[PDB]
Structure formats: C-alpha cells, structure tokens
Design a protein around this ligand. Structure first.
Ligand SMILES: [Ca+2]
Lengths: 182, 358
C-alpha cells in the first residue's frame, strides 16, 4: 500500500491511499502487460457468515484511512498511511501527537508507534523504551523484543496564517515532500 | 527532502521520482487532481509492489470551488464466481495465508484505472496523455530502483519466481539490487494502450482478457464479464470532531474512518498530554483502547452495500463511555469482546458474529 497527498493553488486537497494488498499483490504479473494483480480479496474473512464474508461482487473490508482535518470549514492537515489493519494506529497516533501533544508535523509522524489488535498480537517501533516495554509486558501486554516499522505517513499542513503549505514524508520509506512556487 | 514548504502547491509521496512528477504537473499549472493522477501512474512504475492499475484505492478530494469533500472509491470487487467458502478447503480448514494470497481466487476486479478516469472527468484540467506520459518513459526507458523496492524484491522472491514477474524482477535468477535499472517494457506498452484507447482496453479489451486468462490460470474465476461490469463509486466522508477540529475520513467499505474516530473519542477523555509520549501510561491506555476498537471492527465492519454497519452506535457518546469502563491504568483488561453498539441504533445486524483465526 502507499499513501500520498497533494495541495494546489486553488484550494483543492487530495489524500489518496492506494494498494494491491500484499507487496506485489498475488505476485502474478499479467502476461504481456506488465502489471501486478492484487490479492485484495484475502481481506475478506475466510470463515463466512459475518459482516466481511466473501460474496460475489462484494468489496473486501479495508483499513485504509485517507483523512483531511479541517478548522472552521477549511482543510488544515492531510493524513494517511499504508499498513493494513495497522493504518488505524498510524493515522490516529499522528493526529494525537500533532493536536493533543502539540508536536511539529514531522515529530508527530516520526514518534514511535505501537499497534495491538488483540491480546496476542502486538507491534512497536524502535524508540519505544526498553524498560517501559518490559513493564507493559509484566502488566499483561505481549510486546515482542524486536521492533518493526509501522506505516508510512505522508501529510500536508495548510498554513493559512502564512499562506503556505508544509509537506512531510515519513522516514520509514524514501518518500519526499516537494513544494511548488509559481 | 523529508520536509518541504511551498507557497503555490505541495506534494508528498513515498518515492522521490513520483513526488517530482506530481510537483511538475503543478508547476505547469495543473491542479491537485491532475497531479495525483500523474503520481499514481508514477508510483505504479517506481513503487510497483505497493499500488497501481492492478489494484484499488480511496481518493479523498476537497474541491476548493464547491467546498465539498468526496471520495473516488476504486476498491476491487469479488468476481461473480467467488463463493463464501472459497478460502476454505473441502474439509473446512482455512487455506494458509501465504497460499491463498498467491492464488487466483484472491484477485479482485481492479478499480484504480477507473478511479483515475472518474477523478479526471470531475476535476481534470490536463489531458490524460500528459499525465501518463512521464510514467511511460520511466517504464520504457527504466529508472534506478531504490532501497525499498530492492528489499521488496528480495523478500518476495519466492512469490515472484512463480509468475511472469521473474524475468523482469529476478533476471538470471537474482533479484535486482538498489541502483540497478528496472525496465518495464510490457507495462510501457500497457500505458501506451491506455493513453490511446482509455480504460476500454482494460475493462472491455485486450488487457482485460489477459487479466481474466491469468486469473483463471492461477485458479480464480474472474471473466471478461466481471471486468466489463465494474465501475467505481463516489462516497461522502465519515465525519467526526476532535480537539476543536472536524475530521473527514473514509467510511465503510473501510473500517479505517470509523475506528480511527472511535479510538480518538475513546482516548480523548484521558487527556493523554499529561503523560510523556514514551510513558507506560500512554502506551497502556493506547493498547487497551485498540483492543476494544479492533474487536468492534472484527464484529461489525464490512461492505455497506451488503451489510449494515452501526456507525452511529459505534461513535455514540454513551457507547464510548461504556467502552471506557474497560480502559484504565488500574489493571490490564482481558474482557476484550466487541461491545453492543446496536443499543444506540434503530436496527440490528444482518449477519452473524463469526470468530476468525489469527
Ligand atoms: Ca515510525
């Protein structure tokens, strides 16, 4: 999955998450045509009967979370990330860090993230202190002892006080932010 | 760079070449939608493991003229021959993830290209040939791969070794390394076709027939009729409020918007800035909250064309307080079942709650 975002001189704001499911999807490349085919349908539940069971013509449940934050009716911040079920964690933690902690946009993005969807499934990024991790485990959590990168947030802040934009790309890939001055 | 400023526009993407392509569109007077289209094509070439015309996505757009926020939803669909039990073997056992994720039954009908065409019809100001052309050149003439792509090839070499990927990505049996030139002649040919003919070549044409044929070759059921049936949809966002700000995010058939909003609503009353960002207290409260929200997601989230998602109940302030009884620094909560958001809805679910293996 990948997330990107664009703002222009007319006030349009784009926040776009896009995917083929796993890296390279199925791995199948269309013979003669060069494009990888998604494995998206494995986002459906394998045991049927539930909200996200397989049906013909149905769309498998996503966790993609392209977002635009507004203040007084106008966009101020775009957020989104790859990562499957972890996307919810990346996006909410970015928003918490920027608005509740008052971090810079880049610090909000680079702050180590955690994710846990169950009592037996945990992930954390490097920079989570080791002692604190172990103390959380003593308390009942199940963090492993190796970090993993979580998500890949690209974001634009729309600075209406100064009539400018600020873009940030996450360190977890080689993404970049590029401004435009006409 | 990782951080940039600009007066007249801004792009942020996961690949430097795609960011440059989208910034150039803006420098030449295109709008953010034109640039986004060019960026998707570019990422399909340079970051081919992550997205492209073989997948789908959610493109959220705030329109600076109308002041409306809408979403071009190009999520893939199951073909008509898909069946509820297709991920189970004939004894009812779940087919292992590595296997089922490589099989043709996994392939949804792709939407991305129809998504780009819907966005261009609504908002485009540059011709589609201009927006695809930079990516034709990257595909046909090549570019030096980055580390993320080199790593991905190495990590997925077994999967790629089984398909027509192998001669491009694993030449002479060895993954391409960082800095090696990646040439994608077939992908270029495909982009030329789309440049000439539009999406008919894909959804009612030669590319489509090759998609259906290779899906069937790998055991799936997709047909050309599945391809010609597809169209994207346009969604309104799900909205919430946080810290004095209004947040627009992605509704069902994503879980993302509603559960991101729900996490924020659950944690807001704990005033987490009172705790250091790397404190036990912040991490614990986040972990306890996530366990609750992910459990509601497992129970209640799916494609709203088919199933009724209790969006109002999931975010009702009473329901948030119910769930918050289970989020405390005093103890580790092991009561992590879904809650009952339907108490705060008019109706009931039109499905069962079905445990899924982890
Ligand atoms: Ca990180």
């Amino acid at each position: 999955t990948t997330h990107f975002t664009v703002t222009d001189q007319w006030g349009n704001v784009v926040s776009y998450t896009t995917t083929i499911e796993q890296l390279f999807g199925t791995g199948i490349l269309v013979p003669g045509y060069g494009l990888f085919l998604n494995n998206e349908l494995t986002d459906f539940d394998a045991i049927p009967g539930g909200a996200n069971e397989v049906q013909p013509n149905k769309r498998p449940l996503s966790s993609m979370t392209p977002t635009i934050v507004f203040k007084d009716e106008k966009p101020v911040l775009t957020v989104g990330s790859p990562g499957g079920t972890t996307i919810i964690a990346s996006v909410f933690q970015t928003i918490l860090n920027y608005f509740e902690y008052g971090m810079s946009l880049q610090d909000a993005i680079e702050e180590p993230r955690i994710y846990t969807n169950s009592l037996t499934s945990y992930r954390y990024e490097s920079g989570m202190p080791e002692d604190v991790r172990r103390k959380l485990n003593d308390f009942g959590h199940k963090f492993g002892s190796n970090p993993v990168d979580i998500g890949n947030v690209q974001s634009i802040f729309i600075d209406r006080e100064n009539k400018t934009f600020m873009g940030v790309a996450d360190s977890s890939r080689n993404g970049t932010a590029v401004g435009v001055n006409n | 760079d990782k951080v940039a400023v600009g007066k007249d526009g801004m792009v942020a993407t996961a690949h430097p070449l795609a960011s440059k392509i989208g910034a150039e569109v803006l420098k030449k007077g295109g709008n953010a939608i034109d640039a986004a289209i060019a960026i998707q094509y570019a990422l399909n070439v340079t970051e081919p493991m992550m997205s492209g015309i073989g997948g789908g996505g959610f493109m959220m757009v705030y329109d600076g003229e109308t002041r409306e926020t809408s979403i071009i939803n190009s999520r893939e669909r199951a073909p008509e021959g898909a069946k509820p039990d297709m991920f189970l073997d004939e004894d009812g056992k779940v087919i292992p993830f590595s296997e089922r994720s490589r099989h043709g039954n996994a392939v949804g009908v792709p939407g991305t290209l129809k998504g780009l065409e819907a966005a261009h019809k609504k908002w485009g100001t540059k011709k589609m040939e201009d927006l695809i052309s930079p990516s034709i050149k990257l595909t046909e003439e090549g570019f030096p791969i980055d580390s993320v792509l080199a790593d991905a090839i190495k990590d997925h070499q077994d999967k790629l070794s089984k398909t027509a990927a192998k001669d491009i990505f694993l030449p002479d049996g060895e993954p391409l390394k960082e800095g090696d030139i990646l040439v994608q002649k077939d992908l270029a040919k495909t982009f030329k076709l789309i440049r000439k003919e539009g999406s008919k070549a894909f959804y009612d044409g030669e590319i489509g027939r090759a998609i259906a044929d290779v899906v069937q070759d790998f055991g799936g059921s997709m047909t050309p009729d599945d391809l010609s049936r597809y169209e994207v949809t346009t969604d309104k966002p799900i909205w919430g409020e946080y810290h004095g700000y209004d947040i627009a995010s992605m509704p069902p058939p994503s879980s993302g918007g509603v559960f991101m909003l729900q996490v924020l609503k659950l944690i807001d009353d704990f005033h987490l800035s009172q705790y250091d960002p790397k404190s036990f207290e912040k991490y614990h409260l986040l972990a306890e909250t996530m366990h609750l929200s992910y459990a509601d997601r497992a129970a209640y989230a799916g494609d709203p064309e088919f199933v009724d998602v209790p969006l109002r109940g999931l975010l009702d302030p009473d329901y948030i307080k119910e769930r918050q009884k289970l989020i405390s620094l005093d103890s580790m909560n092991r009561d992590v079942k879904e809650g009952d958001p339907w108490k705060y809805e008019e109706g009931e679910p039109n499905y069962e709650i079905v445990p899924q293996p982890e």
